[PDB]
Amino acid sequence: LTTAEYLAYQTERHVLTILTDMSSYADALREVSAAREEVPGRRGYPGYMYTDLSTIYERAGRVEGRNGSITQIPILTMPNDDITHPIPDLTGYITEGQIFVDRQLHNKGIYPPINVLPSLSRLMKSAIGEGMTRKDHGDVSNQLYAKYAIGKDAAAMKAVVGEEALSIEDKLSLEFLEKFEKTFITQGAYEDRTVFESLDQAWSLLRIYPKEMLNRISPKILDEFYDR
Amino acid sequence: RLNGYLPSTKNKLLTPEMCDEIRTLMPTRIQLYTEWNLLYSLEQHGSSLHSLYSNVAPDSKEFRRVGYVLVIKDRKNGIFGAYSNEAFHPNEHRQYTGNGECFLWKLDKRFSGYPYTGVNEFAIYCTSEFLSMGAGDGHYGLLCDDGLLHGVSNPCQTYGNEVLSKEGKKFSIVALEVWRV
Amino acid sequence: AEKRTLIAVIADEDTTTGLLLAGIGQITPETQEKNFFVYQEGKTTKEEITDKFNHFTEERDDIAILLINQHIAENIRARVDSFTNAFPAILEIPSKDHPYDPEKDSVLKRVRKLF
Amino acid sequence: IVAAVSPAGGDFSDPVTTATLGITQVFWGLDKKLAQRKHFPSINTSVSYSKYTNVLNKFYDSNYPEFPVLRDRMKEILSNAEELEQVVQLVGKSALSDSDKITLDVATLIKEDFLQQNGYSTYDAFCPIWKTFDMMRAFISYHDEAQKAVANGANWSKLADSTGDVKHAVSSSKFFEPSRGEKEVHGEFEKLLSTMQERFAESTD
Amino acid sequence: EQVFPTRMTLGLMKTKLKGANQGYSLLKRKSEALTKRFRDITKRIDD
């Protein structure tokens, strides 16, 4: 963090930092304060981890005068796949949004095995826009999220109420769910895509539905891009 | 000596001059009653082959003498298609379901055609993964993907047709319409 | 469950005659017994009607649809609504010159409620 | 080194297991349910994992290029079957498509034939790599053939009556004891696969 | 308000809760569909 901060705020370089683990950091931290005689806290962890974790994380963000910047992507590891554990709780408390990694998707060979339903990024609204990117990002994001959420439950109901009783919407969503999983998220280990290419592929997937039905998308964007 | 349509406020449809021109070549007793029906489209019915097959229900009881017309526009506005007398629907691999009277064509503002020949009866086929017209040595005369994105067209003995697509060997789809008569 | 192969009727004379000339009620050669009974309005006792119903339902399970006139079924209303098993079909029809009877149909009666 | 942690009551609450997982590369968890049912190999195929799959493809392609994709397909089949089972119990197997029943029965067959094996019978003591490869090919080819046949329109109930023979054949395939030819066995498996294709084709008529 | 197994059995009970929620929603929707189809049967049999 110190070297990254030096670079960013004394050479004006947009820098990105990664850590790749913090659970092992928590272990190393519990080890200390046992050399000292501080009694263990919750789950055996030291109570005061909040302060030092804040110190680690909160050396980020842009600055007023200098043109530099900084970004962090800490990687955690929940012990038994529970969010109730103190480490993920504190990390969510300090940080903005989270990115999940489902076990089931990984079992089905999906790479990167990411599930989007629990994912979230609170500063999206300041990220997308015009110039900074195309104008249709924020709408396609919501549309795809809603349709994926619908498709999951549609697949759930398929087994209990057959397939014919499902509405036309249900069948289209069922097909779209599988297509999305197998093509969009599934990315090769060495396949690099620009944002524009990803947007185009998302448009291709959206083209499954009839133009009218994509309610959440504004009419302007629908008219502009739905063609072809 | 006239034809009608039944679309619903979408960007692209078929032209009346085109249908008048195509009306020339098809079995008699079909050209007589002329009220075309838009059974399926790519714009206002999604872009799913399963949706296409579901929309085109083989409802022949009212009229088993009904012509089925498929019109497809290629990447560069090269319009073409084929005429079929039987509804499309996936079947067992036993046989091609098709009467030896279908034909292909390359339309434009320059009509052409390739009537069925008695050399064989190939690739009048219909399955959940593709829907192709006459074939033989070399790939099929016509082909549309499960996803309705790319297609293939080549000469075949079943029709002796030329290459229809502007991009001959393979191409991409931009708009599709289906008509029932 | 195709043991019930026949159709019984408890109806007036003309309706039964038309039914027979069309022919559904079969004089069972195996039992030498007819599952179709010609109802005599005022002569056949309610006990006989209940007996034939019991036969066709429990003993002679060879009957699928147990038909009966609405007016005639009214005389056995208690018997009509006492038996509520859907495996054997029971349909009520208007009698000779008797118009449609909504209250005389137990199934329709139950339909009107809980609607 | 091949350590062997011991369950401490709870499945994973103990900290020793957490620490070991933090470093150990390959993990072979334990399943209570299978043990309760005397399914002696009780490896839970939902939590266990191994990170050497990524690297082993270099050796695989030199001798058996098909392990990666086939293994992934089998794992997907098992995951789909278990997730379907999750819901089928709450309602019942009445409103199920042909493909659903196919997947369920294939998963059951694999779990009761592929996974299970007793380390006491001569034909089952040690399963060479090639034999496992061929027997895996048999199952996955059977499944994909059935899926293709039903997809084109057919009732799997009727088809199953004819298939019963080849189903029994593939279920009994494991009894081909190794150490006889080491290559003649491969020819036998190939003949079985060809006959399976033939039987489905003719019965598909 | 139950027999009390206190031996770190949290996961089991959470699984039971999730199963209960899933079954509840599924059966709710099944009942909705069946009632919807019941209405038309009533109308058509009446007519």
Side-chain angles (χ1 to χ4, degrees), chain E residues 22-47:
Chain E
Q22 281 305 293
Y24 166 82
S25 73
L26 296 176
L27 295 176
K28 178 66 69 59
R29 280 175 202 151
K30 173 169 171 175
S31 158
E32 295 158 5
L34 291 178
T35 47
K36 180 173 284 161
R37 288 190 184 271
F38 165 93
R39 302 292 147 197
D40 83 349
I41 281 296
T42 49
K43 296 197 294 289
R44 282 172 60 268
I45 198 167
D46 289 325
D47 285 325

mmCIF file of all heavy atoms in Angstrom, chain E residues 22-47:
data_model
loop_
_atom_site.group_PDB
_atom_site.id
_atom_site.type_symbol
_atom_site.label_atom_id
_atom_site.label_comp_id
_atom_site.label_asym_id
_atom_site.label_seq_id
_atom_site.Cartn_x
_atom_site.Cartn_y
_atom_site.Cartn_z
ATOM 1 N N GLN E 22 -38.960 -22.683 0.173
ATOM 2 C CA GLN E 22 -39.069 -23.116 -1.216
ATOM 3 C C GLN E 22 -40.368 -23.877 -1.447
ATOM 4 O O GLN E 22 -41.114 -23.591 -2.393
ATOM 5 C CB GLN E 22 -37.865 -23.982 -1.586
ATOM 6 C CG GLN E 22 -36.599 -23.200 -1.901
ATOM 7 C CD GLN E 22 -36.802 -22.164 -2.990
ATOM 8 O OE1 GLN E 22 -37.044 -22.503 -4.147
ATOM 9 N NE2 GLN E 22 -36.708 -20.893 -2.619
ATOM 10 N N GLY E 23 -40.651 -24.861 -0.589
ATOM 11 C CA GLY E 23 -41.882 -25.615 -0.732
ATOM 12 C C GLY E 23 -43.109 -24.733 -0.630
ATOM 13 O O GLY E 23 -44.069 -24.896 -1.387
ATOM 14 N N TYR E 24 -43.091 -23.778 0.302
ATOM 15 C CA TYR E 24 -44.216 -22.868 0.453
ATOM 16 C C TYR E 24 -44.485 -22.114 -0.841
ATOM 17 O O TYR E 24 -45.617 -22.094 -1.337
ATOM 18 C CB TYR E 24 -43.935 -21.898 1.599
ATOM 19 C CG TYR E 24 -44.868 -20.716 1.644
ATOM 20 C CD1 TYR E 24 -46.122 -20.818 2.222
ATOM 21 C CD2 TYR E 24 -44.487 -19.491 1.116
ATOM 22 C CE1 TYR E 24 -46.975 -19.737 2.266
ATOM 23 C CE2 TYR E 24 -45.333 -18.404 1.157
ATOM 24 C CZ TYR E 24 -46.576 -18.532 1.734
ATOM 25 O OH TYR E 24 -47.423 -17.450 1.777
ATOM 26 N N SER E 25 -43.452 -21.491 -1.409
ATOM 27 C CA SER E 25 -43.653 -20.714 -2.628
ATOM 28 C C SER E 25 -44.135 -21.600 -3.773
ATOM 29 O O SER E 25 -45.078 -21.250 -4.502
ATOM 30 C CB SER E 25 -42.359 -20.000 -3.012
ATOM 31 O OG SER E 25 -41.416 -20.918 -3.535
ATOM 32 N N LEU E 26 -43.496 -22.760 -3.947
ATOM 33 C CA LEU E 26 -43.854 -23.630 -5.061
ATOM 34 C C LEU E 26 -45.301 -24.091 -4.953
ATOM 35 O O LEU E 26 -46.050 -24.064 -5.937
ATOM 36 C CB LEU E 26 -42.906 -24.828 -5.112
ATOM 37 C CG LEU E 26 -41.439 -24.498 -5.394
ATOM 38 C CD1 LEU E 26 -40.588 -25.754 -5.310
ATOM 39 C CD2 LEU E 26 -41.282 -23.835 -6.752
ATOM 40 N N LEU E 27 -45.716 -24.519 -3.759
ATOM 41 C CA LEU E 27 -47.084 -24.989 -3.588
ATOM 42 C C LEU E 27 -48.081 -23.849 -3.744
ATOM 43 O O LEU E 27 -49.170 -24.043 -4.297
ATOM 44 C CB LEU E 27 -47.235 -25.664 -2.226
ATOM 45 C CG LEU E 27 -46.414 -26.940 -2.036
ATOM 46 C CD1 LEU E 27 -46.560 -27.455 -0.616
ATOM 47 C CD2 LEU E 27 -46.821 -28.007 -3.036
ATOM 48 N N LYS E 28 -47.730 -22.652 -3.270
ATOM 49 C CA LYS E 28 -48.576 -21.490 -3.512
ATOM 50 C C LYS E 28 -48.855 -21.327 -5.000
ATOM 51 O O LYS E 28 -50.013 -21.207 -5.423
ATOM 52 C CB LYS E 28 -47.895 -20.236 -2.957
ATOM 53 C CG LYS E 28 -48.653 -18.933 -3.198
ATOM 54 C CD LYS E 28 -49.977 -18.867 -2.450
ATOM 55 C CE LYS E 28 -49.769 -18.765 -0.947
ATOM 56 N NZ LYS E 28 -48.976 -17.555 -0.583
ATOM 57 N N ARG E 29 -47.799 -21.328 -5.811
ATOM 58 C CA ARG E 29 -47.985 -21.079 -7.239
ATOM 59 C C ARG E 29 -48.735 -22.226 -7.911
ATOM 60 O O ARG E 29 -49.567 -22.000 -8.805
ATOM 61 C CB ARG E 29 -46.631 -20.840 -7.899
ATOM 62 C CG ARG E 29 -46.120 -19.427 -7.674
ATOM 63 C CD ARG E 29 -44.735 -19.234 -8.234
ATOM 64 N NE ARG E 29 -44.044 -18.109 -7.615
ATOM 65 C CZ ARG E 29 -42.728 -18.017 -7.481
ATOM 66 N NH1 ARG E 29 -41.918 -18.963 -7.929
ATOM 67 N NH2 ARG E 29 -42.209 -16.945 -6.889
ATOM 68 N N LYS E 30 -48.454 -23.463 -7.497
ATOM 69 C CA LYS E 30 -49.196 -24.603 -8.027
ATOM 70 C C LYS E 30 -50.686 -24.461 -7.749
ATOM 71 O O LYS E 30 -51.521 -24.704 -8.632
ATOM 72 C CB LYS E 30 -48.658 -25.897 -7.416
ATOM 73 C CG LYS E 30 -49.462 -27.137 -7.757
ATOM 74 C CD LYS E 30 -48.717 -28.397 -7.351
ATOM 75 C CE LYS E 30 -49.597 -29.629 -7.480
ATOM 76 N NZ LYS E 30 -48.852 -30.886 -7.197
ATOM 77 N N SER E 31 -51.039 -24.067 -6.524
ATOM 78 C CA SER E 31 -52.443 -23.865 -6.189
ATOM 79 C C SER E 31 -53.051 -22.755 -7.031
ATOM 80 O O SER E 31 -54.197 -22.864 -7.483
ATOM 81 C CB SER E 31 -52.584 -23.544 -4.702
ATOM 82 O OG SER E 31 -53.801 -22.870 -4.446
ATOM 83 N N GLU E 32 -52.305 -21.669 -7.241
ATOM 84 C CA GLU E 32 -52.802 -20.599 -8.102
ATOM 85 C C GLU E 32 -53.174 -21.138 -9.477
ATOM 86 O O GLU E 32 -54.283 -20.903 -9.977
ATOM 87 C CB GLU E 32 -51.753 -19.494 -8.238
ATOM 88 C CG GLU E 32 -51.438 -18.757 -6.952
ATOM 89 C CD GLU E 32 -50.079 -18.087 -6.987
ATOM 90 O OE1 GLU E 32 -49.423 -18.119 -8.049
ATOM 91 O OE2 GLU E 32 -49.666 -17.522 -5.953
ATOM 92 N N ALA E 33 -52.250 -21.868 -10.105
ATOM 93 C CA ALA E 33 -52.507 -22.375 -11.451
ATOM 94 C C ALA E 33 -53.697 -23.328 -11.465
ATOM 95 O O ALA E 33 -54.548 -23.266 -12.367
ATOM 96 C CB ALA E 33 -51.261 -23.071 -11.995
ATOM 97 N N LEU E 34 -53.773 -24.221 -10.476
ATOM 98 C CA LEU E 34 -54.862 -25.189 -10.458
ATOM 99 C C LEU E 34 -56.210 -24.502 -10.285
ATOM 100 O O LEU E 34 -57.191 -24.885 -10.928
ATOM 101 C CB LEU E 34 -54.633 -26.221 -9.355
ATOM 102 C CG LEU E 34 -53.469 -27.183 -9.601
ATOM 103 C CD1 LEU E 34 -53.304 -28.130 -8.428
ATOM 104 C CD2 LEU E 34 -53.671 -27.964 -10.891
ATOM 105 N N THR E 35 -56.286 -23.485 -9.423
ATOM 106 C CA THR E 35 -57.537 -22.745 -9.278
ATOM 107 C C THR E 35 -57.903 -22.027 -10.572
ATOM 108 O O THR E 35 -59.079 -21.999 -10.975
ATOM 109 C CB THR E 35 -57.423 -21.743 -8.132
ATOM 110 O OG1 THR E 35 -56.192 -21.020 -8.249
ATOM 111 C CG2 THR E 35 -57.465 -22.457 -6.791
ATOM 112 N N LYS E 36 -56.909 -21.427 -11.231
ATOM 113 C CA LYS E 36 -57.178 -20.753 -12.494
ATOM 114 C C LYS E 36 -57.796 -21.715 -13.498
ATOM 115 O O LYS E 36 -58.768 -21.370 -14.182
ATOM 116 C CB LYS E 36 -55.892 -20.150 -13.058
ATOM 117 C CG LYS E 36 -56.087 -19.434 -14.387
ATOM 118 C CD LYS E 36 -54.834 -18.697 -14.831
ATOM 119 C CE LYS E 36 -54.625 -17.410 -14.050
ATOM 120 N NZ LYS E 36 -53.221 -16.927 -14.146
ATOM 121 N N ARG E 37 -57.252 -22.928 -13.598
ATOM 122 C CA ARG E 37 -57.838 -23.907 -14.510
ATOM 123 C C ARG E 37 -59.154 -24.475 -13.993
ATOM 124 O O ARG E 37 -59.957 -24.966 -14.790
ATOM 125 C CB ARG E 37 -56.857 -25.045 -14.774
ATOM 126 C CG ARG E 37 -55.695 -24.649 -15.659
ATOM 127 C CD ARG E 37 -54.913 -25.870 -16.083
ATOM 128 N NE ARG E 37 -53.723 -25.535 -16.855
ATOM 129 C CZ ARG E 37 -53.693 -25.404 -18.176
ATOM 130 N NH1 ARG E 37 -54.781 -25.560 -18.914
ATOM 131 N NH2 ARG E 37 -52.541 -25.110 -18.771
ATOM 132 N N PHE E 38 -59.387 -24.432 -12.683
ATOM 133 C CA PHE E 38 -60.654 -24.898 -12.131
ATOM 134 C C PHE E 38 -61.802 -23.988 -12.547
ATOM 135 O O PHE E 38 -62.918 -24.460 -12.816
ATOM 136 C CB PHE E 38 -60.536 -24.976 -10.609
ATOM 137 C CG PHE E 38 -61.848 -25.087 -9.892
ATOM 138 C CD1 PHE E 38 -62.367 -26.325 -9.563
ATOM 139 C CD2 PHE E 38 -62.547 -23.952 -9.518
ATOM 140 C CE1 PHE E 38 -63.566 -26.429 -8.893
ATOM 141 C CE2 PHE E 38 -63.748 -24.052 -8.850
ATOM 142 C CZ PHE E 38 -64.258 -25.291 -8.536
ATOM 143 N N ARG E 39 -61.548 -22.680 -12.591
ATOM 144 C CA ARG E 39 -62.607 -21.738 -12.958
ATOM 145 C C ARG E 39 -63.192 -22.065 -14.331
ATOM 146 O O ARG E 39 -64.420 -22.106 -14.508
ATOM 147 C CB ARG E 39 -62.069 -20.307 -12.938
ATOM 148 C CG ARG E 39 -61.479 -19.855 -11.612
ATOM 149 C CD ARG E 39 -62.538 -19.719 -10.529
ATOM 150 N NE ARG E 39 -62.016 -20.061 -9.211
ATOM 151 C CZ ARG E 39 -62.767 -20.333 -8.152
ATOM 152 N NH1 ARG E 39 -64.088 -20.311 -8.216
ATOM 153 N NH2 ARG E 39 -62.177 -20.634 -6.999
ATOM 154 N N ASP E 40 -62.326 -22.289 -15.323
ATOM 155 C CA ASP E 40 -62.809 -22.521 -16.681
ATOM 156 C C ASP E 40 -63.573 -23.834 -16.777
ATOM 157 O O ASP E 40 -64.570 -23.927 -17.503
ATOM 158 C CB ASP E 40 -61.642 -22.484 -17.673
ATOM 159 C CG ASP E 40 -60.885 -23.803 -17.764
ATOM 160 O OD1 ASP E 40 -61.100 -24.700 -16.923
ATOM 161 O OD2 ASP E 40 -60.064 -23.944 -18.693
ATOM 162 N N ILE E 41 -63.109 -24.867 -16.070
ATOM 163 C CA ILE E 41 -63.848 -26.123 -16.034
ATOM 164 C C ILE E 41 -65.245 -25.887 -15.486
ATOM 165 O O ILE E 41 -66.234 -26.397 -16.026
ATOM 166 C CB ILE E 41 -63.086 -27.173 -15.203
ATOM 167 C CG1 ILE E 41 -61.946 -27.792 -16.020
ATOM 168 C CG2 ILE E 41 -64.036 -28.253 -14.693
ATOM 169 C CD1 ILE E 41 -62.396 -28.585 -17.238
ATOM 170 N N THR E 42 -65.350 -25.115 -14.403
ATOM 171 C CA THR E 42 -66.667 -24.812 -13.853
ATOM 172 C C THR E 42 -67.555 -24.145 -14.900
ATOM 173 O O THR E 42 -68.695 -24.570 -15.133
ATOM 174 C CB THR E 42 -66.528 -23.911 -12.626
ATOM 175 O OG1 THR E 42 -65.654 -22.815 -12.928
ATOM 176 C CG2 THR E 42 -65.976 -24.694 -11.447
ATOM 177 N N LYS E 43 -67.041 -23.099 -15.546
ATOM 178 C CA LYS E 43 -67.855 -22.368 -16.515
ATOM 179 C C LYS E 43 -68.312 -23.282 -17.649
ATOM 180 O O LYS E 43 -69.494 -23.295 -18.023
ATOM 181 C CB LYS E 43 -67.069 -21.182 -17.074
ATOM 182 C CG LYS E 43 -66.720 -20.125 -16.041
ATOM 183 C CD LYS E 43 -66.323 -18.808 -16.698
ATOM 184 C CE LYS E 43 -65.026 -18.929 -17.485
ATOM 185 N NZ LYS E 43 -63.840 -19.080 -16.596
ATOM 186 N N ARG E 44 -67.382 -24.062 -18.204
ATOM 187 C CA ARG E 44 -67.702 -24.863 -19.378
ATOM 188 C C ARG E 44 -68.651 -26.002 -19.032
ATOM 189 O O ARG E 44 -69.562 -26.307 -19.809
ATOM 190 C CB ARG E 44 -66.421 -25.399 -20.012
ATOM 191 C CG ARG E 44 -65.678 -24.354 -20.832
ATOM 192 C CD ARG E 44 -64.319 -24.850 -21.295
ATOM 193 N NE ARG E 44 -64.426 -26.041 -22.128
ATOM 194 C CZ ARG E 44 -64.380 -27.288 -21.676
ATOM 195 N NH1 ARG E 44 -64.222 -27.551 -20.388
ATOM 196 N NH2 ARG E 44 -64.493 -28.294 -22.536
ATOM 197 N N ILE E 45 -68.461 -26.650 -17.880
ATOM 198 C CA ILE E 45 -69.397 -27.699 -17.494
ATOM 199 C C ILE E 45 -70.782 -27.110 -17.271
ATOM 200 O O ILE E 45 -71.790 -27.705 -17.681
ATOM 201 C CB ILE E 45 -68.888 -28.463 -16.255
ATOM 202 C CG1 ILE E 45 -69.604 -29.808 -16.131
ATOM 203 C CG2 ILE E 45 -69.077 -27.657 -14.982
ATOM 204 C CD1 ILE E 45 -68.959 -30.749 -15.143
ATOM 205 N N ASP E 46 -70.868 -25.937 -16.635
ATOM 206 C CA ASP E 46 -72.167 -25.295 -16.465
ATOM 207 C C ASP E 46 -72.849 -25.084 -17.812
ATOM 208 O O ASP E 46 -74.008 -25.477 -18.006
ATOM 209 C CB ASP E 46 -71.999 -23.962 -15.736
ATOM 210 C CG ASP E 46 -71.647 -24.140 -14.273
ATOM 211 O OD1 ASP E 46 -72.145 -25.102 -13.653
ATOM 212 O OD2 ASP E 46 -70.872 -23.317 -13.744
ATOM 213 N N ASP E 47 -72.137 -24.469 -18.759
ATOM 214 C CA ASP E 47 -72.746 -24.171 -20.054
ATOM 215 C C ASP E 47 -73.145 -25.446 -20.790
ATOM 216 O O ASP E 47 -74.233 -25.516 -21.381
ATOM 217 C CB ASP E 47 -71.784 -23.344 -20.907
ATOM 218 C CG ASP E 47 -71.696 -21.901 -20.452
ATOM 219 O OD1 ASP E 47 -72.727 -21.352 -20.009
ATOM 220 O OD2 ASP E 47 -70.597 -21.316 -20.538
#
